[PDB]
Amino acid sequence: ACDYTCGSNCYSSSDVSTAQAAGYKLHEDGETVGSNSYPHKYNNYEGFDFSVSSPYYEWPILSSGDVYSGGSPGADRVVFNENNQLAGVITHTGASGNNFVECT
Ligand SMILES: Nc1nc2c(ncn2[C@@H]2O[C@H](CO)[C@@H](O)[C@H]2OP(=O)(O)O)c(=O)[nH]1
Ligand SMILES: [Ca+2]
Known part of the structure; x- marks a missing residue:
């Protein structure tokens, strides 16, 4: 089962922790990635x-399971x-x- 379901994308808590850690590290260092920064x-x-x-x-979370590094988010x-602290998982x-x- 999915811990978070964004439309048809399924995410586990580990997916979320992983993405979150990457985004937080960038925030702490004052760096950005992608055109939308x-x-x-x-x-x-x-x-x-x-x-x-x-x-x-x-910070984008991707269904591919990879950490965002630029390009379409x-x-x-x-x-x-x-x-x-995780506030939540949201989607367009x-x-x-x-x-x-x-995300439900
Ligand atoms: N809908 C929405 N967009 C936000 C919010 N805060 C920042 N944004 C950004 O504001 C712009 C107009 O909605 C978008 O660039 C969107 O970025 P993302 O596409 O990266 O989410 C928010 O609270 N709600
Ligand atoms: Ca709906």
Whole structure:
């Protein structure tokens, strides 16, 4: 079974930890990757009820199982905070335009 399901993409907690660690390392070093400069601030325009405190940062999680290194980021992201605490997993899949919905 999937710990997180983003549309048709299935992720386990290990997938999430792995992606999160990569994104957090970049954030800590002050470096970015890709044209959209990941990781970057996630403003939470959606108003999600994350149980962990802001600020939040977005970082793509890929269905291929590889860590993001540039190029298309797909529709899924791992949201973490300043303390490397997972806030949640979100996706553009199933949401209109550039909005997000939570992965179930
Ligand atoms: N929908 C949404 N997009 C956000 C938020 N914070 C930052 N973004 C970024 O703001 C821009 C317009 O929605 C996009 O570049 C999106 O980036 P991503 O595609 O990387 O998520 C947020 O809270 N909600
Ligand atoms: Ca739906």
